[model samples]
Target: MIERYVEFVGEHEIDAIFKYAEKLKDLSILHVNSTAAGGGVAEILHRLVPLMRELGLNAEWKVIRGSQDFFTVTKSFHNALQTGKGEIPDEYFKIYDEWQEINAGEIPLDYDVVFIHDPQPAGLVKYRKKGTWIWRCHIDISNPHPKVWGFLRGYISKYDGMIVSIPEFARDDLDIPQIAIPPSIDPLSPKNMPLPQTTVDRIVDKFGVDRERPIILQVSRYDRAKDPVGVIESFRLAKRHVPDAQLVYLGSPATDDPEGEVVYRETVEAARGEKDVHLLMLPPNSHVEVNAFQRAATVVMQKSIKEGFGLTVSEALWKRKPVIGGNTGGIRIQVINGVTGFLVDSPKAAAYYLVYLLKNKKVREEMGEAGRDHVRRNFLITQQLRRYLMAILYLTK
Candidate 1:
């Protein structure tokens, strides 16, 4: 079963990945984070956990617990890392240390390499074991707030190596080696692959949505950068011309983010009475349901202001969905305007394309097909696996 899966990735895409994994003939890896079901960290681990086991590595995954206060503080730290705004209190950094120390004490350290993911577990550097210690900063640390950046730099400096999504995010202060590893989605997974008609119906039924009209879909975890307000504004502008249009902003609750509930509440308050706009705030384990929504939408939208390699953009494009993404971060990497999808600056530009797509269905269809082709060549999980394999080879040597 493992070889079949590995063979699938190797033959179609992960060639460089397998070559790298081969270098580590006897390396054991343990990936530590805060959650296993919600958000990007858990999502990537979903495929990686099994694939590593198939390749003969004693790879393990762990999710540690924290109070709501801990998550709230960490969420602020994450936002600060991305925005380059505000002063992060020294006390926040101190509390972060306390949280990590507690979790580190709980989790057994028996692996050859310990990989700590993002701000949630960066402080795990305090519990570094006998083998290699890597700090994987998944958030866009490219333009971070000075105070927060400085705070994180201390812990970041302790790692043997660091992994960042984009090259620009690498910290010069740390002086440690940095590896660029872009995140990806599995095209064969339910979240990226095509779902059956009955499955699609069941998904929509749970959301209480009507599927007859042309739908504009946005699937994100109700964060400010996901830009839910801009999405609704753009959809309203589109509705003026395309009377048959419907907007579906689908999101699920993420446990790792204590701030998500506040954001969802704010979004609900903002989306007070737009009947055509459907906000399906689901629970964390709604992967197949989200897959069905993405497959059903006429145009899948990724309207993020700042992103850490927007996996949904790649996921939508992989499914041949034409996207109107905010022109930033991973969106810039994925949505090559006039080809896969149009990258725009504001809601107005997104609305303009909404009209263009609604009227010129042929061009829309062509763009969608082009997007699917783009994902096939670039953003699949196999491609991510290939990047990782190569990086580990470089790290281990």
Candidate 2:
């Protein structure tokens, strides 16, 4: 199973992974996160943990349990951590700690290395009995709300090490070693594998999306940070130039996110009365459907107002489609302006780039090829697996 990745990352990279994995083969590694499915963290862990075991390390993954109230508080913390603002009261902090303490009792923490992902399970470190605990923050924490950051920081500073998605997200306020390891897309996953044009047409056509016309796709959760309303507004403006273009905003329900339905309703209201706009809420496991839409899209948009690391951008790029992304967080790292895709600040800028890409086929193809190559070198699953091994090695040594 490990050898299969050599096709994308080459033999030398695979060789190095084994070399790193060999040193940690005897150590027990465990990963803990908020959800078991729905989002990128769980999706990556599904593949990553098995890969770790295949490489001779004893790796396991656990999903932390939380009540709806706990999730609500964490969701607000998510927004506050990203946007630097929130209305969280003192009781909310108690709720956050209560859930973490509850989850800490249920999850084992005796592994040689334990990865606590995001703020949802961050407080679990307070219950740490043994081993190296690493806080794997997958969000933009550069400008977090002071009170929330202060609340979370006390627990975070207890970790042996920390990991952020990019250098821009690294902080000087923390004393622990901060590793910048970007997220990745599985080339072999159903969501990313190559599909025949027939399959693309069949799946997309089934969704009532016209395959013959230009399609703009954004596959993300219906969170406000994703700026679903802004995406619809961009499509509306771009429609003036390319009247035949269609907008497909696809999302799935996450168990930990209580605000998704509210955001979905807001997106529906924003897209109302707009022609050729499709707001889809598929199941989280709808990988093939996502693949088909991405393959059929002429341009992809990940117009996030704030992002941790938009893995969807890499997913679209891996499919050889040009993306128009917001100039924020990890999107800036993946979508290199004029090379892989254009970066925009507002709906008008996103619309301009959308119209430009939809009108010029040659530039889109060029950017598409560059985008795929960029992902091939930097954002594939194998590269991330290697980094995980290295990070574990760093912590253990």
Candidate 3:
């Protein structure tokens, strides 16, 4: 199974991965995150662990369990970290520490390398008895709220090193080594593999998307950060120019995200009387469904006011559909202005780009082809795996 990737990643990278895998084969790796499903982190782990095992490395994944309040605090932490607004209360610190303590006590620390993902379980580093402890932050923390950043810095400073989605996201004050490693997409995943045109049309039509008109789509978790309401406003603005254009919102709720329902409701309310707008709540493992939506979409958008890498941007780009993404964070990495897609700042800006794309088929095709090539050259899982292998080598050296 691992050898099949040689064709996609090329022989050089595949060979390097094999050499490193052999050297680290006897070592155990444990990845700890807040959720087992939903979001990009979980999705990446689903494939990463198996492929690591196939390479003869002992890799495992663990999700730390917490109560609703714990998740609420963590969600608040997530928000505060990204937008650099909203004060996180002092009480939540206790909740976060308590849960991390409990989980740290219960979960075995037998691995030679431990990766703590995000701020949710970062406090677990205090319980580390042996091995290298690394924190992988998947958020845009370039301008984080001071209070929240100070609080997280307590846990973050304790780790052996750190990994962030972009270079700017890395903390300057922290003395630990910080590497910028963006998230990636698996080409072989059910969500990314090519599908027949008939199947694509069938699923899209089943969702009530009009084939005669352009479908402007955004596939993301129902988070306010993704700006679903803003997307609706942009769609409406585009509709004025291209009256036949339709909008589709495929919202997925994450178990770890408590505010998802509220955001989903807001999106539902926003689209209330709009006939061409379709709001879909996809199941947890709706990768293929998402792929079909991207394939059928005339244009895809991330439109995040704040993002942690924006994997959907790359996902859409991989499907050969040009993306309309927020000008912030890692979205900028994939949506190269004028080449892959437009970098929009607001709903007005997004609408202008959307309308332009809907009107210009040649521009869309050109951007779509370029966007796919961009992702192929950079954001594939093979690139991500090579970075991880290098990190392991560096840590264990």
Give all TM-scores, in the order shown: 0.94, 0.99, 0.98
lDDT of 3 by residue, 290-342 (tens): 99999999999899999988889989998889999999999988999999999
Model 2 misplaced stretches (Cα beyond 4 Å) = none
Residue-level lDDT for 386 in candidate 1: 68
The runs of at least 3 residues in candidate 1 whose Cα sits more than 4 Å from the true structure, single-residue gaps closed, are 1-19
Query: 1-397, model 1: which lDDT tens digit per residue?
Result: 3344453345544455556667775888889988878888888998877777776677888887888878878888888888887667778877788888899899886677888888888888877778778888778888888887787788889888998887877777778999878888776666766678899888776777777778899999889989998998898888999988888998877667876667777777777867888987887868888888888888888988888788888888877778999887767878889998899899999999988887887887898889887876777677776676666666766
Off by over 4 Å in 3: none
lDDT head-to-head 1 vs 2, winner: 2
Model 1 residue pairs with clashes: 17-386
Q: Measured by C-alpha RMSD in angstroms, how accurate is candidate 1?
A: 2.0
Q: For model 3, how big is the CA root-mean-square deviation?
A: 1.0
Compose the digit string of candidate 2's lDDT tens values, residues 202-289.
Answer: 9898989988899999999999999999999999999999999999999998888999898888888888798699999998789899
Name the lDDT of candidate 2: 0.92
Task: Please identify which of the two predictions, 1 or 3, would achieve the higher TM-score against the true structure.
Answer: 3
- Candidate 1 backbone clash number: 1
The models' CA-based lDDT, in order, is 0.81, 0.92, 0.90
